[PDB]
Amino acid sequence: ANFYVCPPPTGATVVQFEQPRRCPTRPEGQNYTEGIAVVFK
Amino acid sequence: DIVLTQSPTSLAVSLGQRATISCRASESVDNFGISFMNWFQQKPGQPPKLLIYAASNLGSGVPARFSGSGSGTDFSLNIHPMEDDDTAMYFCQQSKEVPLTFGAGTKLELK
Amino acid sequence: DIVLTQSPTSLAVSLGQRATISCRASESVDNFGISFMNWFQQKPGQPPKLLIYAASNLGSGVPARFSGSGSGTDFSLNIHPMEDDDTAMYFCQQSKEVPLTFGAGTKLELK
Amino acid sequence: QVQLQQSGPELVKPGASVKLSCKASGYSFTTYDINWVKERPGQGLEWIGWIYPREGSTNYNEKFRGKATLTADTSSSTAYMELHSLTSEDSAVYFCATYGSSRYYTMDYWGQGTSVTVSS
Amino acid sequence: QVQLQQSGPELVKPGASVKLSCKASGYSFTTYDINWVKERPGQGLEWIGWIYPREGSTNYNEKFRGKATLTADTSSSTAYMELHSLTSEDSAVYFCATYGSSRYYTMDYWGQGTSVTVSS
Amino acid sequence: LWNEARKLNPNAIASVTVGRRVSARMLGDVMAVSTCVPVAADNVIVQNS
Amino acid sequence: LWNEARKLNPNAIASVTVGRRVSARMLGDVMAVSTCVPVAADNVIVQNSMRISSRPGACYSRPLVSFRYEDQGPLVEGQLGENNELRLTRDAIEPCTVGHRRYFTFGGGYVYFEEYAYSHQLSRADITTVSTFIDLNITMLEDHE
């Protein structure tokens, strides 16, 4: 509910879009060794 | 070359009414959708000043009484009202090709 | 119909300098913002060859010394430098409406 | 590589009828219009019509209603002329042309031409 | 604020050679073309050429091949004229002009002018 | 898509991305921004025609 | 939105979607792609002026570049594009404009131009950066014993 008056821009202020990010890949995934186990108490 | 002709070689006009001249380019002077036609007024003894560039845009530091029109080969200069400040010498010229030329010239004075 | 006129019916020109002819279409031949004007050169005894299509695009297999310009009804052919290979017969023609016609023709030779 | 063969010169009696041929080669004959252009040295070169090989449809220049007629043989990859009532002035060169190199449809491929003559 | 100084009037013998100067001020001299325009009251005002100060490249009006010559001194921020074989009719005013205010490149800044005369 | 939009209507994209109503225009491959002065709603009148 | 964009700038959308820099153009409702030949950064030279001295008021809207495919290949003229793309045809011409300031992507940074004349190269970080991305700071449930 507020108007705006936009003067034409000048080369004084310049902005750019951030380049694509390289954020993490999936973790390797914990390596499991299937086995036959008999736990003792 | 581009030759420029102005139908009034001289044109006496009274104050306050319409003032009109024409400019012929003998061929297209329009590029990029822009008519590279420019209008100059030269008070005698001092260098010419820009009035209208691109055949429609008012030159800076110029009253809105000046007004221009035209496209292709025909271009016109419209003034209203005309005042003593317009009793000068006027040139229409183009800036399309390298040997850019000038109009023959129009003279505006009082009747 | 669209009638085409070329201001030089013949034009003797020396080697190495500017060579210029003109083509008039008697009305608009521009569609889709494209001037459907085409320029042909016909060495005598062998079929004509395309030089410029759409009034500004160089025909394939043609040296850049050929250059074309124009829009609306006025169209021009510019050559620089002109060589013996240009001592030929030249036609400007349009492809706007169905009974597409050809120019009267321009002859370029040596002075 | 795109070539437009044509028949040789014709010596004819005036008022007869002839058949010029345009053997197209180097491209799919049905995919481009075949234009025919009249060439007499006295007058400027004159377009008489063109024919669409794929549909067989054709449009003629108006003045050539019955004087000229176009057919096309896709099997032979050849467009044909059917000239009729050959006046003395009809003796002229006739060029068969088509499209194919320039970006817009323009007559940029041509035959060697055919000089038809009528005399006695 | 953008000013184009020029040399004063020149009284010359016909057939000699002179050197007109255009001292540019108020902007970076190398960033805009310097146009030179011929002004004799009898004829319409005539463009003779322009010079690009940054590269030193220049294009002349065709008829002014050897009669006129342009140089530029970026250090002095000054473009120079080199007139040669000054005919009697060459006596005229010469304006040096540049761009800078109108949106498109147009001659909207001008010097006071220089009236060159040749006589005896 | 954001590159294409900023080519289309640079004002809106710049206003969204920077975080405030700003006038913008492309300078090739970068945007030039300039903050816009707010105006009170009651200080705006529409001509009827 | 992707359909509209591919209609707008098919090169960029095709390059993103296919997964490699490829030239593209629409063939109606499909795209025709063709892989672009990479060019070494050191084999690219920018002409200082975008002016066209042969004609008034006409300026190259995008800097001219001379380049060679190989370290010893013939010097080939061309014009810069977007995302470091080199166009083989110098055709992007626009009317010359006063106050002409432009930054063009060139290698890893920009090549600032003023009045259709080379000014200097800029590092990528020399220009303030605004993010169209939306941060989703998803950290991970740590191991607990």
Numbering used by the authors:
A (entry chain C): 111 to 151
B (entry chain M), C (entry chain L): 1 to 111
D (entry chain H), E (entry chain I): 1 to 52, 52A, 53 to 82, 82A, 82B, 82C, 83 to 116
F (entry chain C): 538 to 586
G (entry chain B): 538 to 682
Publication excerpt:
The postfusion state of gB was selected for structural studies given the biochemically validated mAb binding and the poor stability of the prefusion state. The structures of each antibody complex revealed the basis of the observed, albeit weak, competition; both rAbs bound domain IV (DIV) of gB, but the binding site of each was adjacent but non-overlapping. In contrast, nAbs likely bind to the prefusion or intermediate structure(s) and interfere with the transition to the postfusion structure, a step that is required to trigger the entry of cell-free viral particles.
The most potent protective mAb, BMPC-23, was not neutralizing but activated murine FcγRIV, a biomarker of ADCC. Subsequent Luminex binding assays with recombinant gB-1 protein confirmed that BMPC-23, but not 22D10 or 33B8, bound gB at concentrations as low as 0.1 ng/mL, and Western blots demonstrated that the antibody bound to an approximately 100 kDa protein in infected but not uninfected cell lysates, consistent with monomeric gB. Notably, domain IV faces outward in both pre- and postfusion structures and thus should be readily accessible to BMPC-23 on infected cells to initiate FcγR activation and promote antibody-dependent effector functions such as ADCC and ADCP. BMPC-23 exhibited potent in vivo protection when expressed as mouse IgG2c or human IgG1 antibodies but showed reduced protective efficacy as a mouse IgG1. The ability of BMPC-23 to mediate ADCC and/or ADCP (based on in vitro FcγR activation) is reflected by its epitopic target, which would likely be readily accessible on the infected cell surface. In summary, we have identified and determined at high resolution the paratopic structure of an mAb specific for domain IV of HSV gB that affords protection against HSV disease in the absence of neutralizing activity.
